[model samples]
Target: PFTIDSARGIFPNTLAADVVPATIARFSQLNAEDQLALIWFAYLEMGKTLTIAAPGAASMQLAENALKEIQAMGPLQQTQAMCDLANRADTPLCRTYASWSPNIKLGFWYRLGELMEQGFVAPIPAGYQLSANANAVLATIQGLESGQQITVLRNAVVDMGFTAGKDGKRIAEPVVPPQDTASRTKVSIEGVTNATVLNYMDNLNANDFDTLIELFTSDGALQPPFQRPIVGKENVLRFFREECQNLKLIPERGVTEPAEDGFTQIKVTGKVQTPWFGGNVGMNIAWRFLLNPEGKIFFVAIDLLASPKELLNF
Candidate 1:
Protein backbone atom coordinates (compact mmCIF):
# COMPACT_ATOMS: atom_id res chain seq x y z
CA PRO A 1 0.00 0.00 0.00
CA PHE A 2 1.29 3.45 -0.95
CA THR A 3 0.84 6.05 1.82
CA ILE A 4 0.48 9.78 1.13
CA ASP A 5 3.58 10.49 3.21
CA SER A 6 5.67 7.96 1.28
CA ALA A 7 4.39 9.26 -2.05
CA ARG A 8 4.95 12.90 -0.95
CA GLY A 9 8.57 12.13 -0.08
CA ILE A 10 9.11 11.02 -3.68
CA PHE A 11 6.41 12.81 -5.68
CA PRO A 12 4.70 16.04 -4.66
CA ASN A 13 1.67 16.07 -2.32
CA THR A 14 -0.20 13.88 -4.83
CA LEU A 15 -2.38 10.95 -3.74
CA ALA A 16 -1.51 7.56 -5.24
CA ALA A 17 -5.13 7.13 -6.40
CA ASP A 18 -5.29 10.45 -8.28
CA VAL A 19 -2.71 9.40 -10.84
CA VAL A 20 -3.43 6.83 -13.57
CA PRO A 21 -3.34 3.55 -11.62
CA ALA A 22 -0.84 2.02 -14.00
CA THR A 23 1.30 5.17 -14.01
CA ILE A 24 1.53 5.42 -10.20
CA ALA A 25 2.20 1.69 -9.89
CA ARG A 26 5.06 1.89 -12.34
CA PHE A 27 6.41 5.00 -10.64
CA SER A 28 6.24 3.20 -7.27
CA GLN A 29 8.45 0.44 -8.66
CA LEU A 30 11.32 2.89 -9.17
CA ASN A 31 13.94 3.54 -6.46
CA ALA A 32 13.80 6.81 -4.50
CA GLU A 33 16.56 8.37 -6.64
CA ASP A 34 14.87 7.39 -9.91
CA GLN A 35 11.54 8.69 -8.63
CA LEU A 36 13.13 12.09 -8.01
CA ALA A 37 14.58 12.01 -11.53
CA LEU A 38 11.09 11.47 -12.92
CA ILE A 39 9.74 14.31 -10.83
CA TRP A 40 12.43 16.52 -12.36
CA PHE A 41 11.17 15.41 -15.74
CA ALA A 42 7.67 16.49 -14.71
CA TYR A 43 8.89 19.97 -13.73
CA LEU A 44 10.72 20.34 -17.03
CA GLU A 45 7.55 19.10 -18.73
CA MET A 46 5.85 22.38 -17.91
CA GLY A 47 8.09 25.13 -19.32
CA LYS A 48 11.15 26.43 -17.44
CA THR A 49 13.71 25.43 -14.82
CA LEU A 50 12.82 27.09 -11.51
CA THR A 51 15.99 26.90 -9.42
CA ILE A 52 15.94 23.07 -9.32
CA ALA A 53 18.76 21.03 -10.90
CA ALA A 54 18.38 17.80 -12.83
CA PRO A 55 19.57 14.74 -10.83
CA GLY A 56 21.39 12.72 -13.51
CA ALA A 57 22.50 12.61 -17.17
CA ALA A 58 19.23 10.97 -18.24
CA SER A 59 17.19 13.53 -16.31
CA MET A 60 19.31 16.27 -17.88
CA GLN A 61 18.53 15.00 -21.38
CA LEU A 62 14.83 14.79 -20.55
CA ALA A 63 14.83 18.38 -19.21
CA GLU A 64 16.69 19.67 -22.28
CA ASN A 65 14.17 18.04 -24.59
CA ALA A 66 11.27 19.40 -22.52
CA LEU A 67 12.75 22.88 -22.70
CA LYS A 68 13.00 22.62 -26.47
CA GLU A 69 9.34 21.62 -26.71
CA ILE A 70 8.24 24.43 -24.39
CA GLN A 71 10.35 26.99 -26.23
CA ALA A 72 8.71 26.05 -29.53
CA MET A 73 5.24 26.68 -28.10
CA GLY A 74 3.22 29.86 -28.56
CA PRO A 75 0.96 31.42 -25.91
CA LEU A 76 -2.07 29.30 -26.77
CA GLN A 77 -0.01 26.14 -26.83
CA GLN A 78 1.39 26.89 -23.40
CA THR A 79 -2.10 27.34 -21.97
CA GLN A 80 -3.25 24.15 -23.64
CA ALA A 81 -0.39 22.28 -21.99
CA MET A 82 -1.53 23.35 -18.51
CA CYS A 83 -5.18 22.56 -19.31
CA ASP A 84 -4.32 19.10 -20.58
CA LEU A 85 -2.19 18.29 -17.55
CA ALA A 86 -4.94 19.38 -15.12
CA ASN A 87 -7.58 17.49 -17.18
CA ARG A 88 -9.75 20.52 -17.90
CA ALA A 89 -10.20 23.18 -20.57
CA ASP A 90 -10.90 26.92 -20.54
CA THR A 91 -11.13 26.94 -16.78
CA PRO A 92 -10.45 30.03 -14.64
CA LEU A 93 -7.28 28.38 -13.37
CA CYS A 94 -6.12 27.73 -16.90
CA ARG A 95 -6.72 31.33 -17.86
CA THR A 96 -4.82 32.63 -14.83
CA TYR A 97 -1.94 30.23 -15.39
CA ALA A 98 -1.76 31.29 -19.01
CA SER A 99 -0.87 34.86 -18.03
CA TRP A 100 1.31 34.30 -14.95
CA SER A 101 4.96 35.33 -14.78
CA PRO A 102 7.51 32.56 -15.38
CA ASN A 103 8.51 32.34 -11.72
CA ILE A 104 4.89 32.22 -10.58
CA LYS A 105 4.13 29.53 -13.13
CA LEU A 106 6.93 27.44 -11.62
CA GLY A 107 5.38 27.82 -8.18
CA PHE A 108 2.03 26.68 -9.60
CA TRP A 109 3.63 23.49 -10.90
CA TYR A 110 5.16 22.73 -7.51
CA ARG A 111 1.78 23.17 -5.82
CA LEU A 112 -0.05 21.21 -8.51
CA GLY A 113 2.31 18.23 -8.28
CA GLU A 114 1.71 18.08 -4.54
CA LEU A 115 -2.07 17.92 -5.09
CA MET A 116 -1.69 15.25 -7.78
CA GLU A 117 0.31 13.04 -5.43
CA GLN A 118 -2.47 13.37 -2.81
CA GLY A 119 -5.12 12.16 -5.34
CA PHE A 120 -6.75 15.59 -5.41
CA VAL A 121 -7.98 16.68 -8.84
CA ALA A 122 -10.04 19.64 -9.96
CA PRO A 123 -10.06 22.37 -12.57
CA ILE A 124 -9.46 26.02 -11.73
CA PRO A 125 -12.37 28.43 -11.89
CA ALA A 126 -12.98 31.16 -14.48
CA GLY A 127 -12.59 34.91 -13.96
CA TYR A 128 -10.00 34.45 -11.22
CA GLN A 129 -7.09 36.79 -10.56
CA LEU A 130 -4.63 36.78 -7.67
CA SER A 131 -5.63 39.46 -5.18
CA ALA A 132 -3.13 41.99 -3.81
CA ASN A 133 -3.04 39.94 -0.60
CA ALA A 134 -2.15 36.77 -2.51
CA ASN A 135 0.71 38.55 -4.21
CA ALA A 136 2.06 39.55 -0.81
CA VAL A 137 1.89 35.95 0.37
CA LEU A 138 3.66 34.77 -2.79
CA ALA A 139 6.51 37.13 -2.06
CA THR A 140 7.00 35.31 1.26
CA ILE A 141 6.77 31.91 -0.40
CA GLN A 142 9.52 32.83 -2.81
CA GLY A 143 12.01 33.39 0.02
CA LEU A 144 11.17 30.24 2.02
CA GLU A 145 13.76 27.45 2.53
CA SER A 146 13.15 24.00 1.00
CA GLY A 147 11.99 22.33 4.20
CA GLN A 148 9.81 25.32 5.06
CA GLN A 149 8.33 25.24 1.57
CA ILE A 150 7.23 21.60 1.98
CA THR A 151 5.84 22.33 5.46
CA VAL A 152 3.78 25.18 4.08
CA LEU A 153 2.74 22.98 1.18
CA ARG A 154 1.53 20.14 3.41
CA ASN A 155 -1.13 22.13 5.23
CA ALA A 156 -3.22 24.64 3.25
CA VAL A 157 -2.88 25.37 -0.45
CA VAL A 158 -2.96 28.93 -1.61
CA ASP A 159 -6.50 29.54 -2.85
CA MET A 160 -5.82 30.96 -6.26
CA GLY A 161 -9.58 31.09 -6.85
CA PHE A 162 -9.58 27.30 -7.28
CA THR A 163 -11.09 25.05 -4.64
CA ALA A 164 -12.70 21.61 -4.88
CA GLY A 165 -16.46 21.54 -4.53
CA LYS A 166 -18.36 18.74 -2.72
CA ASP A 167 -18.91 16.98 -6.03
CA GLY A 168 -15.13 17.07 -6.77
CA LYS A 169 -15.39 19.85 -9.34
CA ARG A 170 -13.22 22.96 -8.98
CA ILE A 171 -15.28 26.07 -8.20
CA ALA A 172 -14.20 29.64 -8.87
CA GLU A 173 -14.87 32.55 -6.54
CA PRO A 174 -14.67 35.61 -8.72
CA VAL A 175 -13.58 38.97 -7.38
CA VAL A 176 -16.37 41.28 -8.43
CA PRO A 177 -15.76 44.99 -8.82
CA PRO A 178 -17.47 47.30 -6.40
CA GLN A 179 -20.66 48.81 -7.83
CA ASP A 180 -21.29 52.51 -8.43
CA THR A 181 -23.43 52.97 -5.34
CA ALA A 182 -23.37 56.77 -5.61
CA SER A 183 -24.46 56.89 -9.24
CA ARG A 184 -27.50 54.68 -8.57
CA THR A 185 -29.01 57.51 -6.46
CA LYS A 186 -28.95 61.33 -6.45
CA VAL A 187 -26.51 63.54 -4.50
CA SER A 188 -28.01 65.88 -1.90
CA ILE A 189 -27.00 68.85 0.29
CA GLU A 190 -27.15 66.65 3.40
CA GLY A 191 -23.34 66.85 3.73
CA VAL A 192 -20.12 65.67 2.06
CA THR A 193 -20.30 61.96 2.99
CA ASN A 194 -19.43 58.55 1.55
CA ALA A 195 -21.58 58.92 -1.55
CA THR A 196 -20.09 62.28 -2.47
CA VAL A 197 -16.57 61.11 -1.63
CA LEU A 198 -16.92 57.99 -3.77
CA ASN A 199 -18.40 60.07 -6.59
CA TYR A 200 -15.42 62.38 -6.32
CA MET A 201 -13.11 59.35 -6.56
CA ASP A 202 -15.00 58.14 -9.63
CA ASN A 203 -14.50 61.47 -11.36
CA LEU A 204 -10.85 61.56 -10.36
CA ASN A 205 -10.24 58.08 -11.76
CA ALA A 206 -12.12 58.85 -14.97
CA ASN A 207 -10.15 62.10 -15.46
CA ASP A 208 -13.43 63.96 -15.90
CA PHE A 209 -12.04 67.35 -14.91
CA ASP A 210 -15.21 69.24 -15.86
CA THR A 211 -17.51 67.08 -13.71
CA LEU A 212 -14.90 67.03 -10.94
CA ILE A 213 -14.94 70.84 -10.89
CA GLU A 214 -18.73 70.77 -10.69
CA LEU A 215 -18.43 68.87 -7.39
CA PHE A 216 -16.77 71.92 -5.89
CA THR A 217 -18.26 75.30 -5.07
CA SER A 218 -17.06 78.30 -7.08
CA ASP A 219 -14.95 79.53 -4.14
CA GLY A 220 -13.49 76.11 -3.40
CA ALA A 221 -9.82 75.83 -2.38
CA LEU A 222 -7.41 72.93 -3.07
CA GLN A 223 -4.64 72.40 -0.50
CA PRO A 224 -2.21 69.57 -1.23
CA PRO A 225 0.64 68.77 1.14
CA PHE A 226 3.72 71.12 1.09
CA GLN A 227 2.11 73.24 -1.62
CA ARG A 228 0.44 76.63 -1.43
CA PRO A 229 -3.32 76.52 -1.56
CA ILE A 230 -4.95 76.98 -4.98
CA VAL A 231 -8.22 78.78 -4.35
CA GLY A 232 -11.06 79.30 -6.84
CA LYS A 233 -12.43 76.91 -9.46
CA GLU A 234 -10.06 77.99 -12.23
CA ASN A 235 -6.89 77.32 -10.18
CA VAL A 236 -8.25 73.95 -8.98
CA LEU A 237 -8.98 72.85 -12.54
CA ARG A 238 -5.50 73.81 -13.72
CA PHE A 239 -3.90 72.01 -10.78
CA PHE A 240 -5.86 68.84 -11.45
CA ARG A 241 -5.03 68.84 -15.15
CA GLU A 242 -1.30 69.18 -14.54
CA GLU A 243 -1.34 66.46 -11.87
CA CYS A 244 -3.22 64.06 -14.11
CA GLN A 245 -0.65 64.47 -16.84
CA ASN A 246 2.16 63.44 -14.45
CA LEU A 247 0.47 60.71 -12.39
CA LYS A 248 -2.24 58.08 -12.59
CA LEU A 249 -4.07 57.57 -9.28
CA ILE A 250 -5.91 54.29 -8.74
CA PRO A 251 -8.01 54.13 -5.56
CA GLU A 252 -7.91 50.69 -3.91
CA ARG A 253 -10.22 51.48 -1.03
CA GLY A 254 -11.56 54.40 1.05
CA VAL A 255 -12.98 55.19 4.45
CA THR A 256 -15.40 58.02 5.29
CA GLU A 257 -16.02 59.17 8.86
CA PRO A 258 -17.77 62.30 10.13
CA ALA A 259 -15.66 65.02 11.69
CA GLU A 260 -16.32 68.12 13.76
CA ASP A 261 -17.57 71.52 12.45
CA GLY A 262 -19.86 70.03 9.80
CA PHE A 263 -16.91 68.60 7.89
CA THR A 264 -16.28 65.00 6.79
CA GLN A 265 -12.90 63.23 6.76
CA ILE A 266 -12.16 60.74 4.04
CA LYS A 267 -9.07 58.55 3.78
CA VAL A 268 -8.35 57.11 0.36
CA THR A 269 -5.78 54.34 0.04
CA GLY A 270 -4.43 53.49 -3.41
CA LYS A 271 -1.50 53.15 -5.79
CA VAL A 272 -0.07 55.92 -7.92
CA GLN A 273 1.82 55.28 -11.15
CA THR A 274 4.13 58.15 -11.82
CA PRO A 275 6.62 58.84 -14.56
CA TRP A 276 9.09 59.94 -11.90
CA PHE A 277 9.09 56.54 -10.17
CA GLY A 278 8.72 54.58 -13.39
CA GLY A 279 6.30 52.25 -11.52
CA ASN A 280 3.29 52.14 -9.24
CA VAL A 281 3.94 53.52 -5.73
CA GLY A 282 1.67 52.97 -2.74
CA MET A 283 0.15 56.09 -1.17
CA ASN A 284 -2.30 57.02 1.56
CA ILE A 285 -4.25 60.24 1.17
CA ALA A 286 -6.58 62.17 3.46
CA TRP A 287 -9.28 64.48 2.11
CA ARG A 288 -11.06 66.94 4.39
CA PHE A 289 -14.09 68.45 2.70
CA LEU A 290 -16.28 71.28 3.96
CA LEU A 291 -19.49 71.28 2.05
CA ASN A 292 -21.65 74.28 1.21
CA PRO A 293 -25.44 74.40 1.47
CA GLU A 294 -25.68 72.72 -1.95
CA GLY A 295 -23.40 69.83 -0.90
CA LYS A 296 -20.71 71.19 -3.22
CA ILE A 297 -17.17 71.04 -1.87
CA PHE A 298 -16.20 74.44 -0.42
CA PHE A 299 -12.72 73.52 0.79
CA VAL A 300 -10.72 70.40 -0.14
CA ALA A 301 -7.48 69.49 1.62
CA ILE A 302 -5.17 66.73 0.32
CA ASP A 303 -2.68 65.25 2.81
CA LEU A 304 -0.25 62.67 1.45
CA LEU A 305 1.69 60.10 3.49
CA ALA A 306 4.73 59.82 1.23
CA SER A 307 8.10 61.42 0.78
CA PRO A 308 8.20 65.00 -0.48
CA LYS A 309 10.65 64.05 -3.23
CA GLU A 310 8.61 61.12 -4.54
CA LEU A 311 5.16 62.73 -4.34
CA LEU A 312 5.32 66.50 -3.89
CA ASN A 313 8.36 67.59 -5.93
CA PHE A 314 7.15 65.65 -8.92
Candidate 2:
Protein backbone atom coordinates (compact mmCIF):
# COMPACT_ATOMS: atom_id res chain seq x y z
CA PRO A 1 0.00 0.00 0.00
CA PHE A 2 3.03 2.31 0.14
CA THR A 3 4.20 4.77 -2.54
CA ILE A 4 7.79 5.89 -3.26
CA ASP A 5 6.82 9.31 -1.96
CA SER A 6 5.82 8.01 1.46
CA ALA A 7 8.83 5.66 1.55
CA ARG A 8 11.19 8.64 1.33
CA GLY A 9 9.82 9.98 4.61
CA ILE A 10 10.21 6.65 6.52
CA PHE A 11 13.99 6.54 6.00
CA PRO A 12 14.69 8.51 9.12
CA ASN A 13 17.17 6.13 10.81
CA THR A 14 18.76 2.65 10.74
CA LEU A 15 19.45 2.13 14.45
CA ALA A 16 16.56 -0.17 15.11
CA ALA A 17 17.23 -3.37 17.13
CA ASP A 18 16.24 -5.65 14.24
CA VAL A 19 14.93 -4.87 10.76
CA VAL A 20 17.41 -6.32 8.30
CA PRO A 21 15.75 -9.74 8.01
CA ALA A 22 12.29 -8.42 7.34
CA THR A 23 13.55 -5.82 4.88
CA ILE A 24 15.38 -8.47 2.87
CA ALA A 25 12.35 -10.76 3.08
CA ARG A 26 10.45 -7.97 1.43
CA PHE A 27 13.27 -7.58 -1.14
CA SER A 28 13.28 -11.22 -2.29
CA GLN A 29 9.61 -11.27 -3.20
CA LEU A 30 9.86 -8.65 -5.98
CA ASN A 31 10.23 -9.53 -9.67
CA ALA A 32 13.63 -9.13 -11.40
CA GLU A 33 12.80 -5.81 -13.04
CA ASP A 34 11.39 -4.62 -9.75
CA GLN A 35 14.53 -5.67 -7.88
CA LEU A 36 16.81 -4.13 -10.50
CA ALA A 37 14.91 -0.88 -10.39
CA LEU A 38 15.01 -0.92 -6.61
CA ILE A 39 18.77 -1.37 -6.63
CA TRP A 40 19.24 1.39 -9.18
CA PHE A 41 17.07 3.70 -7.16
CA ALA A 42 18.80 2.93 -3.86
CA TYR A 43 22.28 3.44 -5.32
CA LEU A 44 21.55 6.71 -7.08
CA GLU A 45 19.32 8.08 -4.37
CA MET A 46 21.89 7.22 -1.70
CA GLY A 47 24.54 9.19 -3.57
CA LYS A 48 23.98 12.33 -1.53
CA THR A 49 25.35 10.82 1.69
CA LEU A 50 27.65 8.14 0.28
CA THR A 51 30.86 10.07 -0.39
CA ILE A 52 31.97 7.74 -3.17
CA ALA A 53 29.00 5.89 -4.55
CA ALA A 54 28.73 6.64 -8.29
CA PRO A 55 32.26 5.64 -9.26
CA GLY A 56 33.38 2.31 -7.83
CA ALA A 57 36.91 1.41 -6.68
CA ALA A 58 39.51 -0.90 -8.22
CA SER A 59 37.69 -3.91 -6.79
CA MET A 60 35.85 -3.91 -10.10
CA GLN A 61 39.17 -4.44 -11.88
CA LEU A 62 38.98 -8.23 -11.69
CA ALA A 63 35.45 -8.28 -13.09
CA GLU A 64 36.33 -5.92 -15.92
CA ASN A 65 36.21 -8.71 -18.50
CA ALA A 66 32.90 -10.07 -17.24
CA LEU A 67 31.25 -6.65 -17.14
CA LYS A 68 32.29 -5.96 -20.74
CA GLU A 69 30.49 -9.14 -21.73
CA ILE A 70 27.20 -7.56 -20.72
CA GLN A 71 28.08 -4.23 -22.34
CA ALA A 72 27.88 -5.73 -25.84
CA MET A 73 24.30 -6.99 -25.44
CA GLY A 74 21.49 -4.79 -26.72
CA PRO A 75 19.33 -2.88 -24.26
CA LEU A 76 16.89 -5.73 -23.70
CA GLN A 77 19.40 -8.50 -23.10
CA GLN A 78 21.64 -6.09 -21.28
CA THR A 79 18.87 -5.21 -18.86
CA GLN A 80 17.77 -8.79 -18.36
CA ALA A 81 21.33 -9.79 -17.56
CA MET A 82 21.38 -7.21 -14.79
CA CYS A 83 18.09 -8.53 -13.51
CA ASP A 84 19.59 -12.00 -13.57
CA LEU A 85 22.01 -10.99 -10.83
CA ALA A 86 19.28 -10.79 -8.20
CA ASN A 87 17.12 -13.52 -9.68
CA ARG A 88 19.75 -16.30 -9.65
CA ALA A 89 18.98 -17.36 -13.22
CA ASP A 90 20.86 -20.37 -14.58
CA THR A 91 23.25 -18.69 -16.97
CA PRO A 92 26.99 -18.55 -17.59
CA LEU A 93 26.76 -14.91 -16.64
CA CYS A 94 25.49 -15.81 -13.18
CA ARG A 95 28.35 -18.22 -12.58
CA THR A 96 30.65 -15.58 -13.95
CA TYR A 97 29.23 -12.98 -11.62
CA ALA A 98 29.50 -15.51 -8.79
CA SER A 99 33.25 -15.27 -8.87
CA TRP A 100 33.27 -11.68 -7.65
CA SER A 101 33.71 -10.38 -4.11
CA PRO A 102 30.94 -8.33 -2.55
CA ASN A 103 32.99 -5.23 -3.16
CA ILE A 104 33.39 -6.30 -6.74
CA LYS A 105 29.65 -6.82 -7.01
CA LEU A 106 29.29 -3.29 -5.65
CA GLY A 107 31.76 -2.09 -8.24
CA PHE A 108 30.09 -3.94 -11.11
CA TRP A 109 26.80 -2.19 -10.61
CA TYR A 110 28.49 1.17 -10.17
CA ARG A 111 30.37 0.64 -13.42
CA LEU A 112 27.14 -0.55 -15.03
CA GLY A 113 25.48 2.61 -13.78
CA GLU A 114 28.35 4.68 -15.15
CA LEU A 115 28.18 3.14 -18.59
CA MET A 116 24.44 3.65 -18.71
CA GLU A 117 24.86 7.28 -17.70
CA GLN A 118 27.11 8.00 -20.69
CA GLY A 119 24.94 6.02 -23.16
CA PHE A 120 27.32 3.08 -23.62
CA VAL A 121 25.17 0.52 -21.71
CA ALA A 122 21.52 -0.31 -21.31
CA PRO A 123 19.69 2.30 -19.32
CA ILE A 124 16.60 2.07 -17.18
CA PRO A 125 13.73 3.19 -19.32
CA ALA A 126 12.43 6.66 -18.73
CA GLY A 127 9.12 7.06 -16.93
CA TYR A 128 8.99 3.48 -15.76
CA GLN A 129 6.84 2.83 -12.70
CA LEU A 130 7.67 0.58 -9.75
CA SER A 131 5.20 -2.19 -8.98
CA ALA A 132 3.19 -2.00 -5.76
CA ASN A 133 5.33 -4.69 -4.14
CA ALA A 134 8.58 -2.97 -5.23
CA ASN A 135 7.39 0.23 -3.61
CA ALA A 136 6.38 -1.66 -0.47
CA VAL A 137 9.76 -3.36 -0.26
CA LEU A 138 11.51 -0.05 -0.85
CA ALA A 139 9.67 1.52 2.04
CA THR A 140 10.72 -1.42 4.19
CA ILE A 141 14.42 -0.88 3.49
CA GLN A 142 14.44 2.82 4.35
CA GLY A 143 15.39 2.46 8.00
CA LEU A 144 19.09 1.55 8.06
CA GLU A 145 22.06 3.92 8.49
CA SER A 146 24.23 4.50 5.44
CA GLY A 147 26.57 1.66 6.32
CA GLN A 148 23.70 -0.54 7.29
CA GLN A 149 21.88 0.46 4.16
CA ILE A 150 24.89 -0.52 2.07
CA THR A 151 25.31 -3.79 3.96
CA VAL A 152 21.68 -4.56 3.29
CA LEU A 153 22.09 -3.60 -0.33
CA ARG A 154 25.18 -5.79 -0.73
CA ASN A 155 23.62 -8.67 1.17
CA ALA A 156 20.40 -8.49 -0.79
CA VAL A 157 22.03 -8.35 -4.23
CA VAL A 158 24.39 -11.15 -3.30
CA ASP A 159 21.69 -13.39 -1.84
CA MET A 160 20.40 -15.78 -4.48
CA GLY A 161 22.76 -14.34 -7.08
CA PHE A 162 25.13 -17.08 -6.06
CA THR A 163 22.86 -19.64 -4.37
CA ALA A 164 22.71 -22.10 -7.26
CA GLY A 165 26.42 -22.92 -7.05
CA LYS A 166 27.60 -26.43 -6.13
CA ASP A 167 29.34 -27.19 -2.81
CA GLY A 168 32.51 -25.47 -4.05
CA LYS A 169 30.72 -22.38 -5.28
CA ARG A 170 28.06 -22.10 -2.59
CA ILE A 171 30.04 -19.83 -0.33
CA ALA A 172 30.10 -16.09 -1.01
CA GLU A 173 33.40 -14.88 -2.33
CA PRO A 174 35.83 -14.17 0.49
CA VAL A 175 36.26 -10.51 1.30
CA VAL A 176 37.64 -8.33 -1.47
CA PRO A 177 41.34 -7.69 -1.40
CA PRO A 178 42.43 -4.16 -0.66
CA GLN A 179 40.91 -1.85 -3.26
CA ASP A 180 43.04 0.38 -5.50
CA THR A 181 41.23 3.66 -5.26
CA ALA A 182 41.37 7.32 -6.27
CA SER A 183 39.00 9.57 -8.17
CA ARG A 184 40.47 8.90 -11.62
CA THR A 185 39.36 5.24 -11.55
CA LYS A 186 37.90 5.10 -15.08
CA VAL A 187 41.08 6.33 -16.79
CA SER A 188 42.94 3.68 -18.77
CA ILE A 189 45.70 2.41 -16.47
CA GLU A 190 48.51 -0.04 -17.19
CA GLY A 191 52.18 -0.36 -16.27
CA VAL A 192 53.68 0.46 -12.92
CA THR A 193 50.95 -0.91 -10.69
CA ASN A 194 52.84 0.88 -7.95
CA ALA A 195 50.26 2.21 -5.50
CA THR A 196 52.33 5.26 -4.60
CA VAL A 197 52.69 6.39 -8.18
CA LEU A 198 49.00 5.84 -8.78
CA ASN A 199 48.16 7.72 -5.62
CA TYR A 200 50.35 10.62 -6.75
CA MET A 201 48.25 10.90 -9.89
CA ASP A 202 45.10 10.56 -7.81
CA ASN A 203 46.27 13.31 -5.52
CA LEU A 204 47.27 15.46 -8.45
CA ASN A 205 43.76 15.37 -9.88
CA ALA A 206 42.31 16.08 -6.48
CA ASN A 207 44.65 19.12 -6.39
CA ASP A 208 45.07 18.18 -2.76
CA PHE A 209 48.36 19.70 -1.71
CA ASP A 210 48.49 18.02 1.70
CA THR A 211 48.37 14.36 0.71
CA LEU A 212 50.16 14.94 -2.59
CA ILE A 213 53.11 16.54 -0.79
CA GLU A 214 53.40 13.56 1.53
CA LEU A 215 53.98 11.10 -1.32
CA PHE A 216 57.46 12.47 -1.95
CA THR A 217 60.67 11.82 -0.12
CA SER A 218 62.39 14.77 1.51
CA ASP A 219 64.58 15.03 -1.61
CA GLY A 220 61.78 14.39 -4.09
CA ALA A 221 62.03 16.42 -7.30
CA LEU A 222 60.62 17.29 -10.68
CA GLN A 223 62.27 17.55 -14.09
CA PRO A 224 59.90 19.69 -16.12
CA PRO A 225 59.58 18.90 -19.81
CA PHE A 226 60.98 22.28 -20.77
CA GLN A 227 62.87 23.24 -17.63
CA ARG A 228 65.66 22.23 -15.23
CA PRO A 229 65.08 19.76 -12.40
CA ILE A 230 63.63 21.22 -9.21
CA VAL A 231 64.55 19.49 -5.94
CA GLY A 232 63.24 19.06 -2.36
CA LYS A 233 59.76 18.22 -1.15
CA GLU A 234 59.10 21.88 -0.27
CA ASN A 235 60.16 22.94 -3.76
CA VAL A 236 58.22 20.05 -5.26
CA LEU A 237 55.11 21.10 -3.40
CA ARG A 238 55.50 24.70 -4.49
CA PHE A 239 56.05 23.69 -8.11
CA PHE A 240 52.75 21.83 -8.14
CA ARG A 241 50.95 24.47 -6.09
CA GLU A 242 52.16 27.35 -8.24
CA GLU A 243 53.10 26.05 -11.67
CA CYS A 244 50.87 22.97 -12.03
CA GLN A 245 47.77 24.51 -10.48
CA ASN A 246 46.45 25.69 -13.81
CA LEU A 247 47.49 22.42 -15.43
CA LYS A 248 45.78 19.08 -15.08
CA LEU A 249 47.11 15.74 -16.26
CA ILE A 250 44.60 13.65 -18.20
CA PRO A 251 46.37 10.27 -18.30
CA GLU A 252 44.90 8.12 -21.06
CA ARG A 253 47.40 5.35 -20.37
CA GLY A 254 50.25 4.56 -18.00
CA VAL A 255 53.09 2.12 -18.73
CA THR A 256 56.03 1.21 -16.55
CA GLU A 257 59.12 -0.92 -15.75
CA PRO A 258 62.01 -0.83 -13.31
CA ALA A 259 64.49 1.89 -14.12
CA GLU A 260 67.87 3.32 -12.97
CA ASP A 261 68.68 4.45 -9.40
CA GLY A 262 66.62 1.81 -7.59
CA PHE A 263 63.62 3.49 -9.12
CA THR A 264 60.57 2.19 -10.92
CA GLN A 265 59.70 4.25 -13.96
CA ILE A 266 56.18 5.06 -15.14
CA LYS A 267 55.33 6.25 -18.61
CA VAL A 268 52.01 7.99 -19.14
CA THR A 269 50.85 8.99 -22.54
CA GLY A 270 48.07 11.51 -22.11
CA LYS A 271 46.98 15.05 -22.77
CA VAL A 272 47.68 17.88 -20.38
CA GLN A 273 44.84 20.33 -20.08
CA THR A 274 46.34 23.69 -19.35
CA PRO A 275 46.24 27.38 -20.25
CA TRP A 276 49.66 26.81 -21.88
CA PHE A 277 48.34 24.97 -24.93
CA GLY A 278 45.21 27.08 -24.98
CA GLY A 279 44.11 24.47 -22.39
CA ASN A 280 43.86 21.22 -24.46
CA VAL A 281 45.70 21.22 -27.80
CA GLY A 282 49.35 19.86 -28.49
CA MET A 283 48.43 18.88 -25.08
CA ASN A 284 49.80 15.57 -26.33
CA ILE A 285 52.67 14.58 -23.99
CA ALA A 286 54.42 11.73 -22.19
CA TRP A 287 55.05 11.74 -18.46
CA ARG A 288 57.62 9.94 -16.33
CA PHE A 289 57.92 9.23 -12.60
CA LEU A 290 60.56 7.51 -10.47
CA LEU A 291 59.70 5.87 -7.17
CA ASN A 292 62.53 5.15 -4.76
CA PRO A 293 63.04 1.82 -2.98
CA GLU A 294 61.34 3.16 0.15
CA GLY A 295 58.16 3.56 -1.93
CA LYS A 296 58.07 7.34 -1.81
CA ILE A 297 58.16 9.15 -5.12
CA PHE A 298 61.71 10.11 -6.05
CA PHE A 299 61.13 12.37 -9.01
CA VAL A 300 58.99 13.08 -12.07
CA ALA A 301 59.58 14.19 -15.67
CA ILE A 302 57.49 15.26 -18.62
CA ASP A 303 58.21 15.46 -22.34
CA LEU A 304 56.25 16.29 -25.45
CA LEU A 305 55.13 13.13 -27.21
CA ALA A 306 54.18 15.06 -30.33
CA SER A 307 56.70 16.08 -32.95
CA PRO A 308 58.21 19.60 -32.91
CA LYS A 309 56.41 20.31 -36.18
CA GLU A 310 53.22 18.92 -34.69
CA LEU A 311 53.65 21.35 -31.85
CA LEU A 312 53.31 24.20 -34.28
CA ASN A 313 49.89 22.94 -35.38
CA PHE A 314 48.60 23.20 -31.85
Among the numbered candidates, top TM-score falls to 2
Candidate 2: regions farther than 4 A off: 1-16, 53-58, 163-314
User: CA lDDT, every prediction?
Assistant: 0.42, 0.61
Name the TM-score of candidate 2: 0.47
RMSD of each: 23.0, 19.8
How many clashes does the backbone of model 2 have? Answer: 1
TM-score of each: 0.33, 0.47
Error of 1 at 94 (Å): 57
lDDT of 1 by residue, 1-314 (tens): 02212211221211211112223334434433333334433334432423332122332332343334534566455445543433323564444443332223344455445444443422232333444444344344334433222223322212122323443432122212333545433322222346656667666655567777888767677765434567788978866664443234554444455444454444444444433233423343444455544566766655444332322122
Strongest candidate by lDDT: 2
